[model samples]
Target chain A: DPFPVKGMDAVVFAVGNAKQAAHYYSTAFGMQLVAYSGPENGSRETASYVLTNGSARFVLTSVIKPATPWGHFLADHVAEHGDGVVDLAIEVPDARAAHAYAIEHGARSVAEPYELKDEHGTVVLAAIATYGKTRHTLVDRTGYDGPYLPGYVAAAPIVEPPAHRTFQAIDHCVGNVELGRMNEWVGFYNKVMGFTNMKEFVGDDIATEYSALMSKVVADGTLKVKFPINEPALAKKKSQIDEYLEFYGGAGVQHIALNTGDIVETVRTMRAAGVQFLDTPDSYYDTLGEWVGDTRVPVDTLRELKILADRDEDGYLLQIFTKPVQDRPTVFFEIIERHGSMGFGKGNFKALFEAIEREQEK
Target chain B: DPFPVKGMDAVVFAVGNAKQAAHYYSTAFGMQLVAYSGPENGSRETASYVLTNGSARFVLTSVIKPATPWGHFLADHVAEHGDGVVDLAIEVPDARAAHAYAIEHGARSVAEPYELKDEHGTVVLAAIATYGKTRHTLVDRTGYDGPYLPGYVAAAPIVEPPAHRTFQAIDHCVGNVELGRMNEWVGFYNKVMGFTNMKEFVGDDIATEYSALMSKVVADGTLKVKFPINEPALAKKKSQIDEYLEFYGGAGVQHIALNTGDIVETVRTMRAAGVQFLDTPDSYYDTLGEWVGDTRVPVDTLRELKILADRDEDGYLLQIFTKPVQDRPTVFFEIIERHGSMGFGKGNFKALFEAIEREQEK
Candidate 1:
């Protein structure tokens, strides 16, 4: 049987400066600061800020140095890989059961299930190691009522709240591993989490002439959690996945795809808020009307925003990509709006790979 | 005799993520992106962005790892001290001569004078060690017509330029040193750069009952360059300068004072744009008229914006300070409007220090 997961609890990032990162997400990504834990709150080891856009939550944490082992680990992570993801925490009905099941199936244990209580209520939590240094933190917060976990308190929004949010939920997160490690991770997910491979792309399907990569989609039974694992493929030049692996220093998250209700508005607001997106060739838009018939947004609007459209047997999805959020060309973001689509945008891989190749060439 | 000079060149920061830092300074600080250097431009070791507002320039840089020793130094600096000023570059007519004079006087040499050329003319540059890990880079860009330096190319403004900028020119920069070391650095500038002592404050005049600090200001002859050195004073409670020294890991730039033509507009815009300032007690405004006579801005407006006012022998001025720019309570900014006063805000010291102590208590 599949382990029960409600949804993604939060996407956590170990950054060098959580306060500034909170501001960046608030202003550029249109997230609202919801909770905080720092020295004043007795979180003496690290300062953490929790920001949210609807159901999507992002936890940014920075270490205070030489205090907590977790703090030292976070400091080393940021120092080695710059700003990157350290955890993809998921919400579960029973943290103990999930941890026990995952561990029985081969997942390495990071933390034993424990309950944290405050004036509000109690929250049960456990953790298991995933690829690289990342972990899957199981959070069972059915009884919790405070802003976040026990240590965090409510924090006001850093910037003036915008009229609308940029994204509503985290659709999926992608990871890049070594050349031959993709299938190993795919099997790990299958055995540990009862996740099944939904789609696969290899060789020419997802590769350009100069650079190439292999990708596979793994999702839980309810389709609430999805992760796409990518590995570098042999090509004439360095693949985009290769660049990510080299800069990120090992296997790690490559990009986070956020689900938006209106991608056109999201792109416009994000761009105006100082977010830079990958450029799509005008020629792709010129020929976009041929394969993808009609999205709710017009072709001209998509062209203006450089949004890509793909249609499968089920439906279509409109998506666009932002450049890396930090100095290293490692982690980036994706905005996606699905129209009855249960599939990833497989039809748009060639164009997207070509666009990424153009960026790499620059 | 002193080397002929122009004015401040740029305030360089060693940040964790220059890309996000550039966005922060643009969207929050209201600086325009003037130039850039990165992997695309053959700067493989680090990514740099030069932002400007009128004559004020700030350079944000992040290391790309394992490439340059300078990059590693910057990474280590950020790891140890968060975001901080690494160089207070100054513009001069002859870098070689200024460097020679500085080295002859007790300043340690970091780099000898060298010419850097591109399509845009050539610039002569040299560096000398300053307090802590900071350096003074003398730049002679008389023959250069590039956006910033040779490796940098003109970059489009990151965001739409605000209708009105926050500040104009750099008024002065302040440094916090270890206790009992203020006089040593004051003398260093006086002998090496031919600067003169402009003002001094000690004991009760500038100290609060709970905490205290001693300060001395040194300025270039034409008043184009000003530096104020501060050291902690013995007091009942922890001094603000002592807090700065402890958090910054050593002596370093404490704050950069910006000259605004209109303090009222600047504070209004910056506050609305999400910049937080140190809070002032209501009682300070009630008794403000006793010491500070007539000023351009009314007491009501000053009270509303939490701005401070002071009167010197010559004239009055208006000023306010922003909270620290990073997570660590180290580097910050000051906005000042000089009506003709050549003095730092000596008269407002007790009030400002008290306000700062209020924040430290939290």
Candidate 2:
């Protein structure tokens, strides 16, 4: 395995208004604004806001005037896809080796390995193409320690962060591909980064008659970074993935799941700060403990927050999903608190699909 | 006067994400989300959020899918001119009569007077093109009694409202026009809407060596709806108006002044809520008491908050300008508190110019 990776570096997004987006995440998501690059800092083409919650990092960028290719790409992406992810950057031990290995394994190179140096240190970075205008930016920042990348400067938080943070690290990232194209992307990751599937031959074939879609999880050897790919399956009505593809314009990154130490308090804080989450039916919780047994939080509390739970041989976990952050139903978020499980809530997709269908109507 | 008018109905903006913009206003500006029209209510093309703080209403619109002509225009406006005002809707006694008068007086009709009816009576609305794709929508809502217009449902506030609201009403709206085109629009408003310039013959000729711009304000007989028009004046360096024209793509609305009864509290609330204001130099405040007499707010409090003041024979005003809300240095805001003076801070333009020049450097 020549492509040795550390973990996810950052989830970069191209939004219409990075300033407001930074405010949104700061107040609602409890993410701290750590750094920024914009006209004030001589980066005249685009404004980028770097925010963080513990180990999870999100970079939001928007074009100011769009003079260069990167600026125009940021402009066009937001125009076409609304506010969606453009880069699921991975932190590798050696970016040059990762790029060479990826290119050798039929991966489309978006950028050659390059060095960016400032007073802090030098960082080597490269980019490879992924599904839909999205890219995998391999970053080797072993030699650098700064606010963010080379261009951004340390900035103050937009608003005072909540007393307790919402979540910690990026649990996983899920992408929605075209119908019959999920395995193609899963196999692309398998060859490009030497990743392997989680379990089933095609993974979670949980598609039923009403809510129809197939999902599979892929991860590295150490499972530090995980990717879940989903595609629409034939059904009586349109699948949620199909709806996302139509509004987002193409296959792209769908939702990011954030890990929390205490999800109940995180949900309470986020809800008070104006984050709207998917509602879980009261009946779902009524039958929840019959099979899943007990977890850290009691059944009544989970039902009160509309939080969903799942369990397997490993352990149990609690999770909730947020509505899309933008007008277009494209990019959304998830919060999860794992007791001992390493699963991506496979046991709860049925419940999740039912929750989504409930939201789809009204 | 055929153009008998009320005040401003709303400042309609075409932005990239109305959902986030709504959130931005709710949290930062202390505005309440009063109404909304979006896909949840069968509006699939675009989503619009109507927010208000006292009498000041703002309609933020964004393209969701961009299939209809109106949606395409919104998409194009946001792409071409970042997030900026596209319409300054004015409340008139009779929108049809006002449209007919404006058309008779050389105004280009953007939309013929049309009626929108629902459970809420009916509203006669018409639009006339102004400088740089901006429109002055004549709205006669005398018969309408809904939260907003037809096709919109009442919306709950995005966040819990602040204990103390920031501002009350829209005092004045300013626009930057092309060089030497100041009086052309001033005269257009004069003839089309029976507006008259305040004092100074051609209003304030405040252009100096460094801060070069000609300013003229036109309003109806009651001064209920005021629009200040500015054009670049040649000098040593580029005028602020010129910079606005270049960045905002030709000419458009520059800033909206919101009337607040208590400037000190409003400034504190807005500053604490993550709003950034343009800085006024400390030295300017040192000599402020000698020229501009006492304002409603204490001179020490004014200096502490970097608020600017201007005085004339009639009265004085305490005001502060905010930085551009988006990435582009285009549309901004002004929080103003007036004490009997109807002036638009004409006397403080020199101090404001020095402040702006200081900001231009650092």
Candidate 3:
């Protein structure tokens, strides 16, 4: 069966204020305000806009009609999840057939195949509800051009977006699933999205020191769209994935790590744009430098950017986590500088977990 | 019963991502990034910052906790409310006593009087839940000099705030109430907060020929705080207020009207700052000159600025409305230029409603 794949077209965010959300991401994340849909454009009780940065994109949407399920779904998700990622939609071809295939294979449709057209072109897409209040929409934009699919007209900003640090493509989006359901979701994605499961360490790869968990990375080749499904494993304490499920009210995407060629420069620019990051004590850097022995990047530069560094056999990577973008603690952005090897820095999990656990303690 | 009567000394927004939200409002709305509260300052799961523009101040907060209820509440609100106003908190004199009074008077206690002290001074405040998940907090800043209060430290931003445009004060904060529950909530405010019910009117007072409703203006002289509570009255169709209630999931602050000495310049600067507003056809401006004959401001300027003029027996005022600030179609802002009188402009309701109806129609 032929599937749709190219670069990642867009990710859908069920936001409360599409207009302002659009503005925020554009200004802070360097995305462009490309297009929008709302009551004015004949959208009934809902508004949505397609925001783009280079080839990566995000769709900010909100319901206009009350007593609507989508509206309430967003409410429940936010209340439990906090502002984290909700949907990891993939660009697909033949939305109708693709959705039909999913439905026939036990996928429940979130929305029927809908067509939106503007002066430039049109887009057809369909969605299926997934774990928690989340979904995976099959966006078939093979013929769309009006900026982002149809029904969305090109909307210009009243002012120029604030200059932000230069960050590149969305590296990978992390997902947190129910304790026992992680593999189930992993299986579903492997089957539905034609995703390849990473088989490096297999079952033994669970980072056993702190909170133990099982994780498997899945990706589609065309876009390098990676989704790492994680579930809580047996441990003395609550698993990070379990905490996500409990607080998020259900399963959802955790973070979207954006790739930056020059993380130091990007982080510096982002700092000037008022972007903040988790503070690791100066000692953490001192200890990390001792662990790495020596590297190409200047140690002080890493400290200046507050960038966390980790090295594997192949190469080293620098990364930093953003505060969640919404009121929910679920969705956040990660800026990463990958020298080589496409992998989530497994070594950083302990440090990241400890840092996050401290936040949870507060 | 003596209660804290100081007007809003501050506004706090508990969010999922303080960094991005702060960047959005500071860069787009021209608010200065003033202070911060985070793990380094004894806050674990939450990070907060104070943003100011002239006398108008806003606090953007984000949850650092992954699964806690506080984080959950935020996610739910964001989902339901979508980036709308979460907290419209006011500063008071005695938080504990005020909360005690409200509690004794049947108001729900949302936060107990908590005192935070540092080297600067002690800041005491308490909160009570109000209509529509809104909270009223009485702050005793009588002895606080620290950035916001005890525990909140001065946080220099990575970037300087955008240029200030000389916004003077808050003109009015309009609340949208459910149909028929306007007066009930009004009485709650009167009984709980000791506000004077200075003026009252049905939506008929401000509604155009198409939509109608009622309103009551509450004032605290000591604080110069004015709250205009509005409700949708019986009408042939849903009034805007009613629409607000339905979409927002409950009664909440609708729009904040910001006062400025020069609205034309302010609006122009605001537009340049990336503030978006409701659109009105140019034909509405056909009668701009005749509407407020011999006004201090020029009609051509109003036309050029896209500001609307309203007249009454006493004096006329100039005003314009901004689109909602979040993904959810909830909270927004209004820019008002008061000529001489402090009266609300009832005459402009029709044109404004008609204009809004057209936009909603889209």
Candidate 4:
């Protein structure tokens, strides 16, 4: 029927500074260091640090000297896009089966299934291209007991971890595509991974008089993997997606939404740790009560923290977005606390777009 | 007459990630951020963070997207050499006069004299080439009062700073040259900058049975700036300078020595902050008490921290070296506390080189 899936394996980033990035995620994002791979471990070409918060894992990698071709490629990526995601690996039941099925369905194969083993156990891995230089690495680690992959070794925390986590598992990952390539990727996912369309927004709903974009969401049968693709639409001015494409050098991931159980504490912890969030205008909070109705947090508290709220048919959700983590305004983070709503906060798009536009103007 | 140098203006680094490097220096090295420059300030090609401790200033810079030729060159440098010092800028009384004199005396010009101004005042700047891709920017900020350069804006500290300082000012920077080229650079400095040889070393004194290197120190009349040149010598095994040349791709800065007020506190603080240092053998500590005699810090305490002590004709000094700050083992730092000795830690070189060899073997 459908390819069996487990969950997200890890979100790997090709960064320019893995050591300090590991420190930043530990102190600011409240992620715990778990594994490391570098010169001492025989990984001479690059250094990588793996951090986790709840079920979410982030791997920060950087090139070392005596550069390999792969290392130069990673260096070029960071030079072109500041710091952004390079691989969105997924945990699968059978990496070989997944690779064969995706390739049969017209996906470009990046790597064939291979096995890696150490004293711990064996891990099967494969990869396929998604959009631009991004890839999806299918990982089968049922027999592996290592912290990460075979080469990585367990490492101590870089700093004293937070008393509590800021967020849990990833909610969804959003990607920006070319103007007319959103549907092509959506169809590719539908055929390759047995994912179906979950939501769609077009025309006036997402488009403003000044700027516009269109988006479509696709997810697997189990809903463990979700991706929302966005494309720029014609408007009076440059859309946010246009800005991302222009600066990022091409289409790539835009933001990742992280699921949080307590948005109040999460926002407080991140704000104190110097994480800058998108500013919500006073006017948005003035009418938030009528539109969003009753949510977990009060409007006054949400206004103080600049958190946004939206109510769909099922239930309501609270969310906030951080500014770009690097100098380029290409990638950011969205922290979401959902009650029962399965929606992507479509009703809050207007306020979010306006806020983003204000930042763009500055 | 030789050009009058006020002091060191700043140690400028071209890093792959300036944002995270700023964080690392702040959180781990105990420096305070004072200024920043990025896209918001119209510096679209790159971002920079200026930090300081006492009178010592460090500028960490990284390239942004749509890279310029200079940006690409910087990226290539980081890829080849890891993170390193690009410019050792000198604060001069007259930038134009210094530039003219250096160029007239056989220094290759990198930049002509230019003026940058803002509301505060004006600054005159020029540059001259040094060994490898490194340059010395002559800065005359006598008429300027802004946080840093004209375009940079005043920024607050990134994190809570330490109660006390780490180091005061740069003592000297050491450069590693190719074999047999040390004297050529020594003469170049003597002619171009009117620097005189401070000390010279050769033969078995500074070498072991397996490896050897020769060094010569040069400084200005007032000794505001000093540089020690190193070149690999004939040896039974690979010398440390040869290793650096092989890894760093060419002649470049080897290490920077920062003068600290209290070696005990500085070593303890850096050790606890997760800074890795070169390990001293227990046998070396066994004989340390005899030669070092007595110092302000107890020999037992120095032994516990693996700090080395050297006694010259003037007085004794305590010094410890950190491992390379990046993935490549080329550039590092030396924390030094001098009582009255003006000499580098010559007596400890045998022990230091042996310790480095042990690490290299690993």
Winner on TM-score (2 vs 3): 2
lDDT of 2 by residue, B258-343 (tens): 99989899989999888989877876776788888676677788888999888877888888999889988888999999887788
Q: Where's the lowest-lDDT run of ten residues in candidate 3 chain B?
A: B199-208
TM-score of chain A of each: 0.95, 0.95, 0.85, 0.95
Q: Once model 4 is optimally superposed onto the true structure by TM-score, how far is the C-alpha of residue A285 displaced, in angstroms?
A: 3.3
- List the pairs of residues colliding in candidate 4: none
Give model 4's docking category: acceptable
Residue B85 CA displacement from its true place in model 1, Å:
0.7
Candidate 2's residue-wise lDDT over A1-362, tens digit each? 56787888999999888889898998889999999998888888889999999999999999988888898898898888888899999999999999999999999999999999988888999999999999999999999999998988999988888888899899899999998788899999999999999873223346755447788889998898999998887766567898899999999999999998899999999988888898676667766778789888998899999888887778888889998898898889999998877776767766655656665676
Per-candidate local distance difference test: 0.87, 0.88, 0.70, 0.84
Per TM-score, what order, best first? 2, 1, 4, 3
lDDT of 4 at B112: 99
N/CA/C clash count, model 4 = 0
Candidate 1: which stretches are off by over 4 Å? A200-204, A208-211, A352-362, B203-205, B208-211, B352-362
Query: RMSD (Cα, Å) of candidate 4?
Result: 3.1
In model 2, where do residues sit more than 4 Å from their true spots? A200-205, A352-362, B200-205, B352-362
- Go through the candidates in order and give each one's DockQ: 0.70, 0.79, 0.42, 0.44
What TM-score did chain B of candidate 4 earn? 0.94
Please give the lDDT score at residue B265 for candidate 3.
74
How do the residues B95-152 of candidate 1 rate in per-residue lDDT, one tens digit apiece?
Answer: 9999999999889999999999999999999999989999999999999999999999
| Tens-place lDDT digits, model 1, residues A215-325 | 888988888899999889876667889888888899998988999988988999998988989878766776677788877998888888888888877888899889999
- lDDT tens readout by residue for model 4, B247-347: 78899999988988987888777765556688887566767777778889887888799888888888888998988777666888999898878788877
- Candidate 3, residues B91-162, lDDT tens digits: the string is 776777788888998898888888878899888878888778877777888887777767677866535654
Ranking by lDDT: 2, 1, 4, 3
